[PDB]
Amino acid sequence: PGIVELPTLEDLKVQEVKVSSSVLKAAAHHYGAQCDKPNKEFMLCRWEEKDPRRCLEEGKLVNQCALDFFRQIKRHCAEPFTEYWTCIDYSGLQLFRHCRKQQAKFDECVLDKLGWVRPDLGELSKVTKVKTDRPLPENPYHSRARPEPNPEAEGDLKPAKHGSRLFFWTM
Amino acid sequence: MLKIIIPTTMLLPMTWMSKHNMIWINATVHSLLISLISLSLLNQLGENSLNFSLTFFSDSLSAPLLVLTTWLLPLMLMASQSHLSKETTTRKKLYITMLILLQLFLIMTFTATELILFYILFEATLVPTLIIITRWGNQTERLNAGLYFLFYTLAGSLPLLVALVYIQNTTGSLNFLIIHYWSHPLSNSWSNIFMWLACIMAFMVKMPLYGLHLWLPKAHVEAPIAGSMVLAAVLLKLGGYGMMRITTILNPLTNYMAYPFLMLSMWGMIMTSSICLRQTDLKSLIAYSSVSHMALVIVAIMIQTPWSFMGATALMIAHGLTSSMLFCLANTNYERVHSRTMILARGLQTLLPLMATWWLMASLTNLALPPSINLIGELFIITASFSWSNITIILMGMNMMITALYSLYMLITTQRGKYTHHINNIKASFTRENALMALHILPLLLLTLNPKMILGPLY
Numbered sequence: 323p324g325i326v327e328l329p330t331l332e333d334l335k336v337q338e339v340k341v342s343s344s345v346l347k348a349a350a351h352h353y354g355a356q357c358d359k360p361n362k363e364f365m366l367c368r369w370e371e372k373d374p375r376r377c378l379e380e381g382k383l384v385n386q387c388a389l390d391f392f393r394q395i396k397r398h399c400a401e402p403f404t405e406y407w408t409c410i411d412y413s414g415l416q417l418f419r420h421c422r423k424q425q426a427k428f429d430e431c432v433l434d435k436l437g438w439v440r441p442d443l444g445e446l447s448k449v450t451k452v453k454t455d456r457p458l459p460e461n462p463y464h465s466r467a468r469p470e471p472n473p474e475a476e477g478d479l480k481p482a483k484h485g486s487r488l489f490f491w492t493m
Numbered sequence: 494m495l496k497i498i499i500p501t502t503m504l505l506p507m508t509w510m511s512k513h514n515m516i517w518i519n520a521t522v523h524s525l526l527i528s529l530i531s532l533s534l535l536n537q538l539g540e541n542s543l544n545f546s547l548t549f550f551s552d553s554l555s556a557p558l559l560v561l562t563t564w565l566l567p568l569m570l571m572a573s574q575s576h577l578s579k580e581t582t583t584r585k586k587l588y589i590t591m592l593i594l595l596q597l598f599l600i601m602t603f604t605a606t607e608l609i610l611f612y613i614l615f616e617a618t619l620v621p622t623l624i625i626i627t628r629w630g631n632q633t634e635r636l637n638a639g640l641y642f643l644f645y646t647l648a649g650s651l652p653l654l655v656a657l658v659y660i661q662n663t664t665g666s667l668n669f670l671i672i673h674y675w676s677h678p679l680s681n682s683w684s685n686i687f688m689w690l691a692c693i694m695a696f697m698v699k700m701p702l703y704g705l706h707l708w709l710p711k712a713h714v715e716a717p718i719a720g721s722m723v724l725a726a727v728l729l730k731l732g733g734y735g736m737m738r739i740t741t742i743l744n745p746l747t748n749y750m751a752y753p754f755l756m757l758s759m760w761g762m763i764m765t766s767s768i769c770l771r772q773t774d775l776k777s778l779i780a781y782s783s784v785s786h787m788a789l790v791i792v793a794i795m796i797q798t799p800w801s802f803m804g805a806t807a808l809m810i811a812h813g814l815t816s817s818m819l820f821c822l823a824n825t826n827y828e829r830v831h832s833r834t835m836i837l838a839r840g841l842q843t844l845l846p847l848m849a850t851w852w853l854m855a856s857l858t859n860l861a862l863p864p865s866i867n868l869i870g871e872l873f874i875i876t877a878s879f880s881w882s883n884i885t886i887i888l889m890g891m892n893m894m895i896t897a898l899y900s901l902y903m904l905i906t907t908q909r910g911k912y913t914h915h916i917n918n919i920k921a922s923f924t925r926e927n928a929l930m931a932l933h934i935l936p937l938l939l940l941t942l943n944p945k946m947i948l949g950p951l952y
């Protein structure tokens with residue numbers, strides 16, 4: 323049925339984040355509220371294009387933008403960050419309700435050195451009007467042409483010519 | 494029609510709500526009156542068939558049968574009213590209901606314009622007759638006789654129904670007119686061969702043809718007299734009416750295929766009349782006599798020549814009025830002696846003088862003297878058959894010679910002889926019997942003057 327052409331191995335070398343889950347989830351909200359610009363249009367690319375291959379250009383940017391956020395903490399209160407994310411992992415659910423004191427310590431540090439405020443409840447869960455440059459695909463499913471529907475029935479009803487016309491029956 | 498069908502239908506509530514004892518009176522009144530009305534249709538125009546409505550039409554073949562059926566209706570009433578006067582009012586009313594209904598189907602069948610409408614009512618005649626032979630029969634073999642009559646007629650009629658609807662899908666309409674004016678050459682082919690066989694076998698069984706005829710000696714003999722006429726006097730011709738109409742499309746395949754039917758009828762008619770030469774039941778004697786006459790009609794149709802069709806209708810009407818007469822004759826004795834054996838009641842001219850005279854002209858009409866309509870029919874077929882083949886006059890005349898022996902045989906055995914000693918219950922013939930017999934033979938001899946009315950659609 324054809325060619326399954328896919329991107330080469332050349333473009334699949336991004337500076338992959340080397341962190342673990344706990345440190346990923348320890349920041350989470352601040353990372354989500356400070357790196358939304360590359361997240362939104364890339365995810366919008368994932369939905370609109372309906373194909374992973376066409377969103378490689380945005381796929382690397384979100385990973386790259388993560389590093390700029392991540393190393394920004396290293397030049398700042400990363401020691402409170404280490405104490406935080408090294409206390410989250412100890413819980414099996416990776417739950418924040420048991421690490422509230424370090425939640426404050428990370429928040430109070432990031433509040434003034436950088437200014438990333440704590441996202442209020444429900445703020446992340448919000449549809450956003452992400453600006454984009456790419457035009458919308460003409461057919462995201464690459465749908466082919468459509469069969470022409472059968473001609474529509476019309477015309478005023480007329481009495482059945484010569485009645486029932488079934489064997490000898492008339493009228 | 495509506496002018497005959499509606500009065501026929503309206504007799505049904507009339508007889509049901511009639512007076513307790515006036516049922517036989519009133520039913521006889523208007524049935525004769527309706528027959529008088531049906532005399533109007535005896536006229537036919539030049540060539541186009543008399544057309545009244547889309548579903549009903551008449552020609553110079555249906556009308557001579559239409560008058561015969563409606564004229565018959567009074568005759569069954571008086572003949573049957575002898576023994577029927579000894580049962581419940583509802584039972585007697587139910588009989589008159591059934592003859593009226595049976596006649597109603599016959600009138601509508603003969604004037605049917607659509608072949609499907611023809612077949613529906615043609616087979617619908619089974620129900621009124623089947624109950625007549627079974628319920629009111631006066632023997633034990635009637636139970637087997639009714640099954641034989643019903644199954645034989647139905648087993649042939651069902652292929653016709655499949656064949657008939659096939660014409661509807663392929664050719665189009667099955668009106669007896671549009672079929673005629675759009676006749677196409679039915680070429681010889683195996684599918685057409687079975688097409689021919691299906692459209693023909695249904696009418697052949699009801700003739701009946703030699704071999705498909707064993708229902709007749711059982712049905713006719715066991716049937717009550719009101720029935721014993723119609724199973725021999727009208728509805729055998731109903732199969733005849735089917736043949737002369739359905740053969741409009743079966744050309745030219747008919748001449749190639751007719752040979753088994755011609756030989757069966759032409760040779761079997763000698764054998765059937767040979768049964769009549771040695772018989773024991775008077776009803777069976779006339780019954781097998783009907784087979785021989787109908788067998789002569791069977792061969793007559795298949796040459797499909799102007800003379801044959803005329804002699805077909807001439808014999809067809811004449812035999813029905815004749816064979817109906819003989820069944821009245823056998824009825825009179827069967828009531829007096831309460832048996833059907835011929836030799837039991839030898840000698841009737843000595844005791845019943847005019848009964849012998851009616852028997853004389855009855856056996857003479859079957860003998861088919863000139864110019865009796867029986868002779869004017871058989872003679873026409875002989876000339877038509879002779880033109881087809883010169884050898885057939887050996888077979889055709891042999892029956893004419895053979896039919897003389899048996900037709901006069903019950904005349905000798907019953908009438909011309911010493912009266913049987915032990916029998917003592919013979920009564921002077923009721924004026925009903927003699928009046929009925931005159932109602933049979935007077936139109937027949939009167940019809941001799943003008944055979945053009947009954948000569949068929951080719952005069």
Ligand SMILES: CCCCCCCCCCCCCCCCCC(=O)O[C@@H](COC(=O)CCCCCCCCCCCCCCC)COP(=O)(O)OC[C@H](O)CO
Pocket residue numbers: 648649652655656659660684685687688690691694
């Ligand atoms: C009780 C036994 C039978 C008694 C005698 C009955 C009459 C004898 C003939 C039997 C067959 C009657 C059925 C006829 C149906 C309609 C006939 C007709 O119009 O002709 C068609 C031909 O009819 C037939 O083909 C069927 C009839 C032939 C016989 C086969 C079936 C009947 C025999 C078995 C059933 C009945 C026997 C009793 C079984 C218990 C034409 O169509 P075609 O074949 O050209 O179709 C188009 C194309 O060429 C291909 O189809």
